């Protein structure tokens, strides 16, 4: 869907900004500093689930740029495994949110965060 590689870069950077806001805005909730409204969180995690599938299609062939390391492309299978592990952790966060249990949410939230950082450590430029 991108006329030029710059358009894919702009897309993924916007997707990731959204995704970071929808994830990160839950930090006060999982820390107990903001109240836990199970329906609020369920709806937010549904938005996060949609967003979290979006970046990966915007690292298509020829879309080198931004803060993406070139190894995303030369080690495609290993990058796919980090994105699929992350996505699987988003499924687990959805399950916790759908269950309405703050203990499970905070554990699932931590797992997702770990998965974000693991990918960045390997595939995001410093």
Ligand X SMILES: O=C1O[C@H]([C@@H](O)CO)C(O)=C1O
Work out which of 6, 7, 14, 20 binds ligand X, going by CB under 6 A.
Answer: 20
**What is the longest distance spanned by two Cα atoms in the chain?**
45
Cα gap 87→72, rounded to integer Å:
17
Does residue 66 bind ligand HEC (CB under 6 A)?
yes
Q: Is 60 left (phi over 0), alpha (psi -120 to 50) or beta?
A: beta
Which does residue 15 touch among ligand X, ligand HEC, a second copy, none (CB within 5 to 8 A, set by kind)? a second copy
Cα gap 122→48, rounded to integer Å:
23
# of chain residues touching ligand X (CB under 6 A): 7
Q: Toward ligand X, which CB reaches closer, 63 or 86?
A: 86
Helices 76-99 and 102-123: crossing angle in degrees, nearest 10, is: 170
Does residue 29 bind a second copy (CB under 8 A)?
no
Annotated ligand binding at 12? The verdict is yes
φ/ψ (deg, to 5) at 34: -125, 150
Question: Rule CB under 6 A: which residues touch ligand HEC?
Answer: 9, 12-13, 16-17, 19-20, 23, 66-68, 82-83, 86, 112, 115-116, 119-120, 123-124
Question: Rule CB under 8 A: which residues touch a second copy?
Answer: 1, 7, 10-11, 13-15, 17-18, 21, 24-25, 47, 50-51, 54
């Amino acid at each position: 869907q991108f006329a030029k590689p710059e358009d894919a870069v702009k897309y993924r950077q916007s997707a990731l900004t959204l995704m970071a806001s929808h994830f990160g805005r839950m930090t006060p909730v999982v820390k107990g500093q903001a109240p836990y409204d199970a329906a609020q969180i369920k709806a937010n995690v549904e938005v996060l689930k949609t967003l979290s599938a979006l970046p990966w299609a915007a690292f298509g062939p020829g879309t080198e740029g931004g803060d993406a390391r070139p190894e995303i492309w030369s080690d495609a299978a290993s990058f796919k495994q980090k994105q699929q592990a992350f996505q699987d952790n988003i499924v687990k966060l959805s399950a916790a949110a759908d269950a309405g249990d703050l203990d499970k949410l905070r554990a699932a939230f931590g797992d997702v965060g770990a998965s974000c950082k693991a990918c960045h450590d390997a595939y995001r430029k410093k």
